[model samples]
Target: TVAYIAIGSNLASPLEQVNAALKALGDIPESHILTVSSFYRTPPLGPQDQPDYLNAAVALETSLAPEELLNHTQRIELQQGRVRKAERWGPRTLDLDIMLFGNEVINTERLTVPAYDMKNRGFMLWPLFEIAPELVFPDGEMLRQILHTRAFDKLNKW
Candidate 1:
């Protein structure tokens, strides 16, 4: 199955964190990274006190199921020194989110496919659009349509 992943980091050399995570993704067994977007600098989405984030998106072809991929991503986060917190979008060494899982609509206690709040996030959408303009959302919306909105006006590719 093919999956789209969103990557972001604001701590510990943000660019390196994202780059390393990308490398890690390719290292997963039975998985291959199909494409990666250039990093973008975006205003922090959670709190204003933290550093701005370096964000990018990747397309992956993996044999793992959605939950299995989620677990693998979390492990990569932990390997990168990520710490779970109560704060929403607090500073982190690495953040990996499964944005879409093979057009599958998944809703569960631990995960959500077509990731929660995905449409409203410019940071996620812009980078994703860079590499996957034709990608379709689970709702059948086009990614390019979403990327053309003013909602992403501030995102700058870096």
Candidate 2:
């Protein structure tokens, strides 16, 4: 299976965590990282003060099933000291999202392929697109429908 992962961190030595997480992703059994994107640095918006976030993407080659891969990714988050928060999209030690799992659309109680909110977040999209120019959803949906290439101008490529 081919998977695209989104990585984000803003606290607990973000760069450090992102790096470690990448290594861990490659270490996943029956899987290896294909290509990783350049890191992107962005700060919190609208007066919310927080450390700049480090965002990156991974193209993974895996034989692991979606649920199993999801389990591995969430486990990595805990091992990296991610703190569960009541608030949404705030600081975190790390976040590893199974952004796309194979080419199959996944919808279950615990996961969503292409991640429900991912399309709107250009940070992750840019990183993925940076490496995969013709990136598309499993159903061959155009990523451009959600965002044109130029809209990603804000991503501070590493």
Candidate 3:
């Protein structure tokens, strides 16, 4: 299966946290790091009163199930000091979210992981296009076209 995920970090060296997550994913025996988008600096999303988050989208080839991959991502977050306390969207050392698993349309009450509004989030699509420009949705729209509507500015190197 192909695993796609979104990653963000806003506290304790954002760059380090993002890189660590990538490294950790690569460390997984059943997983292969496919590609990652360039880093993006964007204002916090929900509950909007926090430091800007450094975010990126990464794709991986993994044999793990969707739920299994989500579990692994949660484990990585734990290693990076991800706590679910106080406010929503508060700054954190790491934030990882599974965007999709192959062409799966998983719409269960228990999960809503696939790049929700990814087409509208330049922080996610712009970098994604940089690495995989030929990408297309099941609907036949090119990723480049989708990325044009979002707002984001690229950060430094990966």
Which is superior by lDDT, 1 or 2? Answer: 1
- Determine which window of 10 residues in candidate 1 has minimal summed lDDT: 81-90
Query: How many clashes in candidate 3?
Result: 0
State TM-scores per candidate.
0.87, 0.86, 0.79
* lDDT (C-alpha, whole model) for all candidates: 0.85, 0.81, 0.72
lDDT of 3 at 107: 70
Whichever of 1 and 3 has more TM-score, that candidate is 1
Per-residue lDDT of model 3, residues 128-155, tens digit only: 6666787776556777776665565654
- Give the clash total for candidate 2: 0
Q: Give the lDDT of residue 10 in candidate 2.
A: 79
> Per-prediction count of colliding residue pairs?
0, 0, 0
Winner of 1 and 3 under lDDT: 1
Candidate 3: C-alpha lDDT: 0.72
- Show where candidate 1 strays beyond 4 Å: 44-50, 84-90
Q: Which residues of candidate 3, in runs, are more than 4 Å off?
A: 44-51, 84-89, 149-158
* Tens digits of per-residue lDDT for model 2, 1-158: 78999998876577788888998999999998999999998885455676777899899999998999999998888777545553344445678888898778988898899799787788888888878888778777777665754354476764
Q: Give the worst 10-residue stretch by lDDT in candidate 2.
A: 82-91
> Per-residue CA lDDT of candidate 1, range 107-128, in tens?
9999999899989998898888
